[PDB]
Amino acid sequence: RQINTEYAVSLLEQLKLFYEQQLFTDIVLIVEGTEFPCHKMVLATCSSYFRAMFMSGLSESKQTHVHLRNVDAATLQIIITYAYTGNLAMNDSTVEQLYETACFLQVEDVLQRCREYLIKKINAENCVRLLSFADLFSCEELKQSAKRMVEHKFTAVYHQDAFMQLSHDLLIDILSSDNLNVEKEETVREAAMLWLEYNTESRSQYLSSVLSQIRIDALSEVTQRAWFQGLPPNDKSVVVQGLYKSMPKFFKPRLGMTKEEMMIFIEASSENPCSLYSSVCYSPQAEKVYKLCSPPADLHKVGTVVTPDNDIYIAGGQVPLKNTFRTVNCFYWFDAQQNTWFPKTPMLFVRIKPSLVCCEGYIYAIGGDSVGGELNRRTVERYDTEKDEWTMVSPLPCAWQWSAAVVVHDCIYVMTLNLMYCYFPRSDSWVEMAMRQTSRSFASAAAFGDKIFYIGGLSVTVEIYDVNKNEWKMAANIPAKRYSDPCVRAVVISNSLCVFMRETHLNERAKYVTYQYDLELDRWSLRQHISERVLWDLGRDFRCTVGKLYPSCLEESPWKP
Template sequence: MDVTNDVHSNSVLRDLNEQRGRAELTDVVLEVEGRSFPCHRAVLASCSPYFRTMFTSGYAEAKQERISIQDVSGVAMATILDYAYTGRLQTEPDQVQAVMSAARLLQVDFVGRKAAEYMKDHLDVSNCVDVLMYADMLADCGLVEATKKYVASRFDQVTLHPSFVQLPLNHLQSLLDRDDLMTNSEDNVVQAALRWVDFNQEEHLQHLSTLCKSLRQSLISTILRAEIENKLVSTDSKIVYSDNTTKRLGQVRTELQVFIREGFSDSEHFSDAECSAPCYDPSTGRLYAMNMPENLNSVTKSVTVTTDDELYLAGDITETGMKEGQKKFYQYNHLLNTWEPRCEMITPRASCGLVYLKGYIYAIGGDDTKETAERYNPSCDEWTSIPPLPHPISSKFCAVTLNDSIYVISNFEGCYSFSTTENKWSKIADMLYPTEHPQAVTYQGCIYCIECNGKCGDSSCVEMYNPTTDEWKMTGKYFYFFDTATLMTYAKTMYLLTIHSGDDPEFDTDRDGGCTTLNICQYEPKTDSWRSLKETQPVPPLARWLNTACRTKCLTVRMIPMCLGDPKAYEMDYCCVGGYSDDSFPENSDSDDPSDQEDSDEDNSVEDGQSETDDGDI
């Protein structure tokens, strides 16, 4: 007979833990910070080489019934003992460092490793410097390097935090030497060094000449060079700058178009692409991929971008057994291509209107009452409530900003504006033809809106709202049909993207045997008309990918292509449309050579019923 009892090991541990709770058959008591922990020597020795050596050697503790443990907190010891008896590691965030220190001393490798991983995953601007110094004290090289990379990824923000000036000279200099600093200018690097010096001039001023070796002279303004020279007059130190002329990574961003899907209509065909968002460089035709949070509920997510290219996302992480509903809020890390948790919203929201305006992020609607709103302050990572909407709105709405106001456009529930200067909502004119799934952009002082989901079968048009006259009007001449549509602005121009699925074999064929075409039109303000583009390609030919979303938002963001992911998730769609072949698909997204791609206008087809000699209207 050869059988295994799968529950035996868990049963034994559970029984031993119950014995520990009753101090039954225990043979040693650990004394830590005035607390007593009855234990079994065999259990301690089985998971800790520290205790195994103690109990099996000639040390006096091997025979003692009570053993005092130094340099370990009572809370940390309780955590490690719970792990030893249950296999489960559970602790409060503010105790992670103490638990890691105890695990290192007691040689409980799993606990120490998981504590380090937790700190890596929960780095933020407020704690990264402290974690760096702590990791250095423990000589944890992996955690040190991970933390330095995080500091580099948030350099401009970290240098303003009070803990930055506490950095030891060696770590400060190693940071200033890095090429991957996410800083807008070399002057910011200089100012960070000067801030560190000014915090404690008596001790730090003598090191300024050393720090200058990490500062890139050709990129520093004359004003700051003069300030450095003035500070070093009294030290008689010779100024030697770095002759490195390479710009820091944050200074060489590339303007890309980022496409975010909000709500899926056919997502099963693109499961590999759901965890990323395509980023497109119209100047080179190259495609990249921005990672999205894992297990993100795409139907509920909303994304916005600030004027300094910071991306924020409100979305629900769908997990088995968990109730869906946004409080979740994230900020994108350009260097690491990851999303970092920020302060949760006050109210759970699904498909809220997320917009940026003059230093603040606003989350509108999407709550149970469908009328509350709140505002996020990035400088202090805090949400505060703002006045609710005058009338509840459904989840099918969009929000845009113009001047000092936020505009909310809902389907059949009216349109509203929120004045950030007056802190109040006002009713504005309703659309001429209310849309069920509105998508809008602002362009040249007006708001343009379209029904983005044409699969309901109704024809649609682009409407323009003039805030000065409080009036809506139709742009162009015609109503038209499509499956999905997206309005976007790029390089001071507005475009209309329409997707049409049909049976024309000349165009891209999807897996169901049909064909999907992407049509692009450019708005002509002088004639108030739309012109079909035939030779330019301002968007990636991702017809099928764009067609799987109920609504697609296009954001123009300065990104770092070399830090983005592999675009292979979109390869099938990208290679089959617009003349791109499998051979020309850019396998290495880090390459800057666009010569391996071919220009084509095959997918700039004219919509059904539109002549190529049309006067430019849809």
């Protein structure tokens, strides 16, 4: 039995003290002239290479001085600090060299720690770099994660400097995969070309291999003429092998072309009584209802946000204590292919129904019950999508509840009962814009074009605001029925303003129908009526947002018409 109370801590601390005082040392590591007198026992324990270094009978087993090369001394001191105390304390810059030295020394625990740290830090730019790093040092978890991140982002960037310097096998795996998040088939073609234009006459065979990989759909466009311009002289059989890649090799449709603009819904009426709420989706064009997996599977009252790059995030929320609703500041992100939710850096305050707004690539969480007891309650907190951290910003002018916030013209706009403040995204200047003549709450707003459409409130209030004009005006009243309960939802659909409303009467069933609204007509034309045979009841606390999803990755929601 390992008694952790007395001996373990005391033994570890005394070993660390002996290391500090250079006591009972019998082995010293020479690293480019730097001396590291650590002790044989702890070396052989942590590392799986030092045990063979000191146990296997050779000339270095009986050697007081050992000249170990190809290892960094700063990283080696970090390793020996982790070896005398159990604490790694890794930064964000020296992770690559630390992992390389750990792999060379075969230290499993620090290898796993660095693997987890790297798999948690594939943010935006090191994706291709760490993918190449994992290709050099075999790491299945890192390889798969970096491959997915590359298939997600490089398909939208395809210009990274590090991407040019890649091995043939990794590039073939990337290109031949059917996970390319590209809505068009020419971008991958030009990416492959530019990968084969900066290094030509050196990778001509690999040029032919990538040419075959990109396949006929993009091979029949321009590649022949560009290659004729750039081919080496006196090349004949290369023409023969290039001409062959027209008929064969199974031309098939890709997966990134299925970016159907749909609607993501949360907190729906769960089918099985064992579950409370569920997240589902609706297809405006396919006229189908898809489902999504709950991010925590137990926590509710979350807020949604969609970046211009079509990303889904979940922040805040409350979960039942399950003693024998507590608020959690956790954060999550939705995977567009794996149909799962990977968590991210949690917030600093446990918010209830936060309002997340994206601007300048930053996620801004406005209001939503930060803590309540916090003296400064009229406050906000934003997110960094690149650095993966939360930065405090200028607080709210006035404290508001059940508010809504949108982004227009790269500027933060938050709407409340009657007031509105514009927060300069860069100058952090909360300046009052205009005040509504009607006091309505429990409503949301949509940022369509350059006009904010605040719909609903307690109703059918249609108050249109323009940034360039800075004024509030009414347009019309949405066609509703007598004694109805219009749950209004305003959102952009296919670059056209539309609404999604549900009416409820006494002893009557709910009806779902979306209307097409015109700017100059001030009328909501009947666009499409959602049939109850495909979509069932949603509820009251459901939320709506616009985003593109994959039908194959998701699954249809089974429900009897």
